[PDB]
Design a protein around this motif. Structure first.
Motif, PDB file in Angstrom:
ATOM      1  N   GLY A   2       0.891  -1.086  -0.034  1.00 13.50           N
ATOM      2  CA  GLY A   2      -0.055   0.059  -0.034  1.00 13.50           C
ATOM      3  C   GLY A   2       0.799   1.271   0.007  1.00 13.50           C
ATOM      4  O   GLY A   2       0.145   2.238   0.156  1.00 13.50           O
ATOM      5  N   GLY A   3       2.236   1.121  -0.267  1.00 14.00           N
ATOM      6  CA  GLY A   3       2.987   2.535  -0.260  1.00 14.00           C
ATOM      7  C   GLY A   3       2.900   3.029  -1.456  1.00 14.00           C
ATOM      8  O   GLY A   3       2.084   2.784  -2.352  1.00 14.00           O
ATOM      9  N   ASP A   4       3.512   4.236  -1.652  1.00 11.85           N
ATOM     10  CA  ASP A   4       3.660   4.809  -3.137  1.00 11.85           C
ATOM     11  C   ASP A   4       4.423   3.510  -4.323  1.00 11.85           C
ATOM     12  O   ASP A   4       5.244   2.951  -3.704  1.00 11.85           O
ATOM     13  CB  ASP A   4       4.280   6.123  -3.189  1.00 11.85           C
ATOM     14  N   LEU A   5       4.147   3.869  -5.629  1.00 11.48           N
ATOM     15  CA  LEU A   5       4.699   3.029  -6.343  1.00 11.48           C
ATOM     16  C   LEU A   5       6.385   2.732  -6.213  1.00 11.48           C
ATOM     17  O   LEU A   5       6.677   1.700  -6.696  1.00 11.48           O
ATOM     18  CB  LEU A   5       4.269   3.423  -7.538  1.00 11.48           C
ATOM     19  N   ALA A   6       7.007   4.046  -6.065  1.00 11.40           N
ATOM     20  CA  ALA A   6       8.517   3.881  -6.278  1.00 11.40           C
ATOM     21  C   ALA A   6       8.966   2.934  -4.923  1.00 11.40           C
ATOM     22  O   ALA A   6       9.814   1.957  -5.081  1.00 11.40           O
ATOM     23  CB  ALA A   6       9.089   5.131  -6.126  1.00 11.40           C
ATOM     24  N   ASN A   7       8.345   3.499  -3.798  1.00 10.38           N
ATOM     25  CA  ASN A   7       8.748   2.442  -2.500  1.00 10.38           C
ATOM     26  C   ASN A   7       8.310   0.889  -2.528  1.00 10.38           C
ATOM     27  O   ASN A   7       8.999   0.113  -2.378  1.00 10.38           O
ATOM     28  CB  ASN A   7       8.241   3.351  -1.265  1.00 10.38           C
ATOM     29  N   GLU A   8       7.011   0.745  -3.196  1.00 11.69           N
ATOM     30  CA  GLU A   8       6.680  -0.615  -3.670  1.00 11.69           C
ATOM     31  C   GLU A   8       7.580  -1.290  -4.696  1.00 11.69           C
ATOM     32  O   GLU A   8       7.866  -2.638  -4.250  1.00 11.69           O
ATOM     33  CB  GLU A   8       5.279  -0.513  -4.019  1.00 11.69           C
ATOM     34  N   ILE A   9       7.969  -0.677  -5.733  1.00 12.62           N
ATOM     35  CA  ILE A   9       8.895  -1.388  -6.521  1.00 12.62           C
ATOM     36  C   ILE A   9      10.390  -1.685  -5.748  1.00 12.62           C
ATOM     37  O   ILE A   9      10.885  -2.775  -5.996  1.00 12.62           O
ATOM     38  CB  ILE A   9       9.583  -0.589  -7.905  1.00 12.62           C
ATOM     39  N   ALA A  10      10.785  -0.878  -5.032  1.00 16.45           N
ATOM     40  CA  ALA A  10      11.905  -1.197  -4.156  1.00 16.45           C
ATOM     41  C   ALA A  10      11.650  -2.512  -3.226  1.00 16.45           C
ATOM     42  O   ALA A  10      12.349  -3.276  -3.228  1.00 16.45           O
ATOM     43  CB  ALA A  10      12.567   0.117  -3.672  1.00 16.45           C
ATOM     44  N   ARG A  11      10.761  -2.321  -2.539  1.00 21.54           N
ATOM     45  CA  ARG A  11      10.185  -3.449  -1.538  1.00 21.54           C
ATOM     46  C   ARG A  11      10.280  -4.700  -2.349  1.00 21.54           C
ATOM     47  O   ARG A  11      10.661  -5.799  -1.883  1.00 21.54           O
ATOM     48  CB  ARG A  11       8.997  -3.361  -0.956  1.00 21.54           C
ATOM     49  N   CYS A  12       9.490  -4.796  -3.346  1.00 29.52           N
ATOM     50  CA  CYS A  12       9.156  -5.985  -4.261  1.00 29.52           C
ATOM     51  C   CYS A  12      10.534  -6.524  -4.874  1.00 29.52           C
ATOM     52  O   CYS A  12      10.888  -7.772  -4.737  1.00 29.52           O
ATOM     53  CB  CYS A  12       8.247  -5.714  -5.381  1.00 29.52           C
ATOM     54  N   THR A  13      11.287  -5.751  -5.149  1.00 32.80           N
ATOM     55  CA  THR A  13      12.667  -6.101  -5.677  1.00 32.80           C
ATOM     56  C   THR A  13      13.432  -6.830  -4.501  1.00 32.80           C
ATOM     57  O   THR A  13      14.031  -7.762  -4.658  1.00 32.80           O
ATOM     58  CB  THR A  13      13.481  -4.986  -6.125  1.00 32.80           C
ATOM     59  N   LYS A  14      13.586  -6.252  -3.268  1.00 31.89           N
ATOM     60  CA  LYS A  14      14.041  -6.995  -2.193  1.00 31.89           C
ATOM     61  C   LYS A  14      13.669  -8.250  -1.984  1.00 31.89           C
ATOM     62  O   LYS A  14      14.104  -9.150  -1.670  1.00 31.89           O
ATOM     63  CB  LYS A  14      14.040  -5.938  -1.031  1.00 31.89           C
ATOM     64  N   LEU A  15      12.200  -8.242  -1.888  1.00 30.84           N
ATOM     65  CA  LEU A  15      11.468  -9.684  -1.469  1.00 30.84           C
ATOM     66  C   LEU A  15      11.710 -10.652  -2.627  1.00 30.84           C
ATOM     67  O   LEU A  15      12.082 -11.847  -2.173  1.00 30.84           O
ATOM     68  CB  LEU A  15       9.929  -9.520  -1.488  1.00 30.84           C
ATOM     69  N   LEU A  16      11.936 -10.408  -3.851  1.00 28.61           N
ATOM     70  CA  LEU A  16      12.304 -11.114  -4.776  1.00 28.61           C
ATOM     71  C   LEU A  16      13.626 -11.546  -4.662  1.00 28.61           C
ATOM     72  O   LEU A  16      13.808 -13.125  -4.888  1.00 28.61           O
ATOM     73  CB  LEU A  16      12.054 -10.926  -6.598  1.00 28.61           C
ATOM     74  N   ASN A  17      14.643 -10.965  -4.256  1.00 28.29           N
ATOM     75  CA  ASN A  17      16.050 -11.443  -3.974  1.00 28.29           C
ATOM     76  C   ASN A  17      15.841 -12.324  -2.955  1.00 28.29           C
ATOM     77  O   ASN A  17      16.703 -13.174  -3.120  1.00 28.29           O
ATOM     78  CB  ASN A  17      16.978 -10.161  -3.933  1.00 28.29           C
ATOM     79  N   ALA A  18      15.245 -11.946  -1.921  1.00 25.71           N
ATOM     80  CA  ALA A  18      15.396 -12.820  -0.763  1.00 25.71           C
ATOM     81  C   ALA A  18      14.676 -14.199  -0.838  1.00 25.71           C
ATOM     82  O   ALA A  18      15.430 -15.195  -0.538  1.00 25.71           O
ATOM     83  CB  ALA A  18      14.591 -12.004   0.317  1.00 25.71           C
ATOM     84  N   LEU A  19      13.736 -14.347  -1.552  1.00 27.45           N
ATOM     85  CA  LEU A  19      13.056 -15.528  -1.895  1.00 27.45           C
ATOM     86  C   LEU A  19      13.596 -16.189  -3.083  1.00 27.45           C
ATOM     87  O   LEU A  19      13.528 -17.502  -3.037  1.00 27.45           O
ATOM     88  CB  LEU A  19      11.597 -15.058  -2.426  1.00 27.45           C
ATOM     89  N   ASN A  20      14.623 -15.681  -3.751  1.00 27.23           N
ATOM     90  CA  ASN A  20      15.536 -16.395  -4.895  1.00 27.23           C
ATOM     91  C   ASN A  20      16.899 -17.002  -4.325  1.00 27.23           C
ATOM     92  O   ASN A  20      17.578 -17.077  -5.217  1.00 27.23           O
ATOM     93  CB  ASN A  20      15.715 -15.235  -6.019  1.00 27.23           C
ATOM     94  N   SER A  21      17.002 -17.307  -3.055  1.00 28.94           N
ATOM     95  CA  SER A  21      18.251 -17.959  -2.365  1.00 28.94           C
ATOM     96  C   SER A  21      18.486 -19.188  -2.957  1.00 28.94           C
ATOM     97  O   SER A  21      19.619 -19.544  -3.130  1.00 28.94           O
ATOM     98  CB  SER A  21      18.152 -17.950  -0.983  1.00 28.94           C
ATOM     99  N   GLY A  22      17.574 -20.008  -3.586  1.00 33.55           N
ATOM    100  CA  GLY A  22      17.472 -21.017  -4.134  1.00 33.55           C
ATOM    101  C   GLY A  22      17.494 -21.234  -5.656  1.00 33.55           C
ATOM    102  O   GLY A  22      17.406 -22.193  -6.502  1.00 33.55           O
ATOM    103  N   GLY A  23      17.365 -20.073  -6.442  1.00 26.51           N
ATOM    104  CA  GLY A  23      17.375 -19.946  -7.899  1.00 26.51           C
ATOM    105  C   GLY A  23      15.984 -20.216  -8.342  1.00 26.51           C
ATOM    106  O   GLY A  23      15.717 -20.384  -9.517  1.00 26.51           O
ATOM    107  N   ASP A  24      15.040 -20.169  -7.218  1.00 27.71           N
ATOM    108  CA  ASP A  24      13.682 -20.514  -7.921  1.00 27.71           C
ATOM    109  C   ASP A  24      12.702 -19.438  -8.657  1.00 27.71           C
ATOM    110  O   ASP A  24      11.648 -19.526  -9.293  1.00 27.71           O
ATOM    111  CB  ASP A  24      12.859 -21.140  -6.676  1.00 27.71           C
ATOM    112  N   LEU A  25      13.449 -18.311  -8.527  1.00 27.69           N
ATOM    113  CA  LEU A  25      12.798 -17.063  -9.117  1.00 27.69           C
ATOM    114  C   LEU A  25      13.605 -16.516 -10.288  1.00 27.69           C
ATOM    115  O   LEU A  25      13.402 -15.278 -10.426  1.00 27.69           O
ATOM    116  CB  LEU A  25      12.466 -16.207  -8.033  1.00 27.69           C
TER     117      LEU A  25
END
Length: 60
Positions: free
Chosen positions: A1-24
Motif C-alpha cells: 500500500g505505499g507509493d509505487l516507487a517505494n513498492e517497486i523497491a520493496r518488491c525487488t528486495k523480496l524477490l531477491n530474498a526469495l531467490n536464495s535457491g534460484g527458484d525465481l
C-alpha cells in the motif's frame, strides 16, 4: 500500500530474498528488465503492464 516507487523497491528486495535457491530466475529477470527499462530501449509501459500482476501480489 505505499507509493509505487517505494513498492517497486520493496518488491525487488523480496524477490531477491526469495531467490536464495534460484527458484525465481524468470521473475528476477522481469524485475531487472523493468528496473533498467529507461536504459535498455525497452517499452516501459508494456513492461510495467506485464509485471503489474507481481507488484499487485506483493503490494503493501
Amino acid at each position: 500500500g505505499g507509493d509505487l516507487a517505494n513498492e517497486i523497491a520493496r518488491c525487488t528486495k523480496l524477490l531477491n530474498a526469495l531467490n536464495s535457491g534460484g527458484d525465481l530466475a524468470n521473475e528476477i529477470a522481469r524485475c531487472t528488465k523493468l528496473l533498467n527499462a529507461l536504459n535498455s530501449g525497452g517499452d516501459l509501459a508494456n513492461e510495467i503492464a506485464r509485471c503489474t500482476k507481481l507488484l499487485n501480489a506483493l503490494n503493501s
